[PDB]
Design an enzyme around this catalytic site. Sequence first.
Site, short mmCIF file in Angstrom:
data_model
loop_
_atom_site.label_atom_id
_atom_site.label_comp_id
_atom_site.label_asym_id
_atom_site.label_seq_id
_atom_site.Cartn_x
_atom_site.Cartn_y
_atom_site.Cartn_z
N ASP A 418 42.67 39.83 36.17
CA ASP A 418 42.10 38.97 37.20
C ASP A 418 42.03 39.75 38.51
OD1 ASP A 418 41.12 36.67 38.47
OD2 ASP A 418 43.14 36.02 39.02
N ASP A 737 47.04 35.20 37.70
CA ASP A 737 47.90 34.47 38.62
C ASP A 737 47.44 33.05 38.89
OD1 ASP A 737 45.73 35.66 40.40
OD2 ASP A 737 46.81 34.39 41.82
F1 BEF Z 1 39.43 36.33 40.20
BE1 BEF Z 1 40.53 35.70 39.30
F2 BEF Z 1 39.84 34.70 38.34
F3 BEF Z 1 41.63 34.99 40.11
MG LIG Z 2 43.71 34.73 40.58
#
Ligand code: BEF
Ligand SMILES: [Mg+2]
Length: 1032
Positions: A418, A737
């Site tokens: 992410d 997260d």
């Molecule tokens: F960009 Be991630 F989905 F927090």
């Molecule tokens: Mg995130």
Amino acid sequence: SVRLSGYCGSPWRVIGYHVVVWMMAGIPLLLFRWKPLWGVRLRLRPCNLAHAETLVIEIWQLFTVQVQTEVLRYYLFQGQRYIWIETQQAFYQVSLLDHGRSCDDVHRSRHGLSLQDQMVRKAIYGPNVISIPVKSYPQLLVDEALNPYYGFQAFSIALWLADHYYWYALCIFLISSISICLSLYKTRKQSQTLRDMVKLSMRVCVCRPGGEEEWVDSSELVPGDCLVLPQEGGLMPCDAALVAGECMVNESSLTGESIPVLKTALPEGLGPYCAETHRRHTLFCGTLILQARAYVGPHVLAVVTRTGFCTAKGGLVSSILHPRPFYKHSMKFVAALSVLALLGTIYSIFILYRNRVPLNEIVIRALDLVTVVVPPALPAAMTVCTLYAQSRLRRQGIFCIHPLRINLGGKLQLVCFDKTGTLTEDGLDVMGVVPLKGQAFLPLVPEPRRLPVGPLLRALATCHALSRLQDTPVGDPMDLKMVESTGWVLEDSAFGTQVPVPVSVLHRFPFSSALQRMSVVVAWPGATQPEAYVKGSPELVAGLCNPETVPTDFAQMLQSYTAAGYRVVALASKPLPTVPSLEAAQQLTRDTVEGDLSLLGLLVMRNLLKPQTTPVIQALRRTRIRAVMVTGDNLQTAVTVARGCGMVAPQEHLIIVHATHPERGQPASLEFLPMESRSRHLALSGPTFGIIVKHFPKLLPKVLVQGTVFARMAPEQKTELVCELQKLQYCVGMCGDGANDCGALKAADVGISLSQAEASVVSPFTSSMASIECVPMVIREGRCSLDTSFSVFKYMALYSLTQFISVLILYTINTNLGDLQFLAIDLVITTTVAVLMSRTGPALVLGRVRPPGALLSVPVLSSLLLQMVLVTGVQLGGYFLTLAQPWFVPLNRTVAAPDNLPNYENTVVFSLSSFQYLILAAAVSKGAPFRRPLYTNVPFLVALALLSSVLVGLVLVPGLLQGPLALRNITDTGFKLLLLGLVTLNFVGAFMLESVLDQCLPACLRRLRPKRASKKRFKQLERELAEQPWPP
Ligand code: BEF
Ligand SMILES: [Mg+2]
Ligand SMILES: CC(C)CCC[C@@H](C)[C@H]1CC[C@H]2[C@@H]3CC=C4C[C@@H](OC(=O)CCC(=O)O)CC[C@]4(C)[C@H]3CC[C@]12C
């Protein structure tokens, strides 16, 4: 479709089920866990849904849910609450109760909710909490502690109790039970610690009808409550719909978007309110409010719409409560071992029949095949290995509630990351200010406080609408970041320098969503006239400045900055001929100060990479582990972060794949957009990925193999991406997260969670720090755990075959090893070694080469066979060397063991084998690349040294434990020294064999059988793409 089956209960039948499932055996509990329908039929009788205390839910997949009551019956399926509606005779979910109510209803709900209605709706909807129930010790036991090897251990315990070995079966049972209970305690304590750092409540202010208010807990919130949002913002307790004022929300935890979102009041109308149609007006649970500003009235009101698991975050975390599916590589190894053990068992049966021992003894020795294949201390050794790995991870701050998945960290070939909150910060930080000298731009200044005392510095400091609340600046988040960057201190208003002249604001024009700009008028002592500043959208602010102040390359530079995901905001100023007084500067109309400006510069806001992200990404790319960015943010920011992060090197090509939706008369099309500034990466968005999955199923594997940036990617799309990567026989890890990453973390093989919410309490791994430094730590620990598990299995195999060969050599002589010698060899030596050898930590650095993933390897089997040849040679040499001595007298062949003991053959064989059990333990304990060197294991070194000293004392000291261990006292000191010499030759031979194999066997395998292909689908795809790239 689903079907709900009702089952009522009777006390007599309940007690009968309990007794038949407990007093008979523990097997029925596991059988009912495998198939719950049998358990619910045996315990519960079928009944009516209106009278049921139990439901069996199949969606077939069968779940049993109890029917709780609060005269309000309900049940909870994966978090969702289904109350029993008494007028339509069904269990309708509480999510459907607010469906259809319009915006006028939501606006009428702005006068709070009465207390009686509050209790009614809290009975209907339950607490406003996302609570995941704790797994009980039985469930934790079944899912974590047990192994299929504990079945072998139970069978061997039954065999021991049948042959009346009580003080051996009891010790094995105690060791296994202690290991299991300690592992369960550690896992349960880790889960409880994870759930104790999650705050499930707040203190929220709610309107109450009658003009009053009250500060209630965040769990007393029910759909209908009117929240009073604080002006300083804060975390959002539930899902609400703004009816007054407006908010500035950071939805990076639910959507992954890093730019703050402006939520406006819901518009009055007869149309039904929808959380998708009116998402611009809804506040979502878990998102962070950065500023709540109200025009009308003194409060920012937001009518609560969804609470608990029916929120957006609750729906995201509910999808991971659905149960979905470690030893298969080792069962093949134990079957290969079972082949040799069966051959040895046939030989033992034959040679015992020649000795004419009782048939019951023969059949017991035949059944001893199971103990030979799976040693008594193998399950305990594996459990202790996982415990050591889990404790080592915990001491680094990483919580692992699934210790069996630690070995999967050493098999990872790809890690999905992410971006917002994982690789970068949650919001936008100041990239810098771009000043202007003369008519053209200047280089970007990363620190605006380093600027001189000029118009641009005062514009950055004072051009905003910040306020002081509880000795902290409260206002627009971008204004807060800008003033923090400039270093000036807030005290109409006055500003003191970071350490110049403190300039005082004389007037302020508020920021308008139509003009997209704001203005201030400031003055300072020692000035000739006030100076008016303007800050707003660069395209329109530059339309107010003079043509000779805006650079000719303004549009090109603005496009370059906004094509990288930066939030540029322009600044302008103009000397005012007004007298420096508040009697005239407070009456200036906006139109006069907005005109004829002078562009001072641009203020670039960007999503900032964390300092711990780039080194980790470069480390993973150095060890040839694929780094994939899976984000919910836009494509420009994701691509910029990947390029500046290390996922895409400056010399590696990046291609944007853009799928076009198939409209009427045209099919879906792929066009590839190469950009400027694996050597071929692919970047694509969420809709593009969704179109490629369904309209181009043949090109999807190539996208998955080459793609490195996945932006605008929905949580369902994130978990679908993880599953599709796993379908290519990847071992996919995931670090996230937010609540959008829960599905990806659950679907991944190794999911590390950086979250501080309920998303973390059900994740396999949960780092205590908000950086991705845990990913290399988890990978190193996984490689160490895999190497340690392989070493433990190899040591158990070597032990079992060594003891079996010793026992066979003694059986050929009509001798046995001895009861207390067996106890010593097993408990004192092998249990201690297997417990203490799993304590060596991981290596300090990662490496290019991964540990082997299968126990049946030509290296493993070849090493085992060579070590067995050396061990058998040493034992047979000791035997045939004892048989050529003057002091040697043969045993009494007429009587059988343990009555012919003590004799010389058993003494010599036990003396050599006891040293072999430590040599083969120090040999298989390898250090680099995946583990620390052996000498860093102080307990294991001390155990080896003490056991070696004890065995040397047995060999050399005359009369030391020769009575208890049923050994024979040898008077020839030359023979004792010669036996010790044989032991040293075995030691050096084992270590030289291990080194020679580890250093020369892979080369021999490569030269003999050239492996020119691989079976992993992603490797074949990579080969095919190297031969012919898919985008030419
Ligand atoms: F960009 Be991630 F989905 F927090
Ligand atoms: Mg995130
Ligand atoms: C029936 C009678 C006459 C025989 C007695 C045999 C004992 C000497 C054996 C039985 C179990 C053995 C124990 C099996 C397990 C271990 C684990 C080991 O300790 C640890 O695991 C600590 C780990 C850490 O350092 O973190 C020390 C050896 C010890 C207690 C062994 C020491 C020798 C023991 C006590």
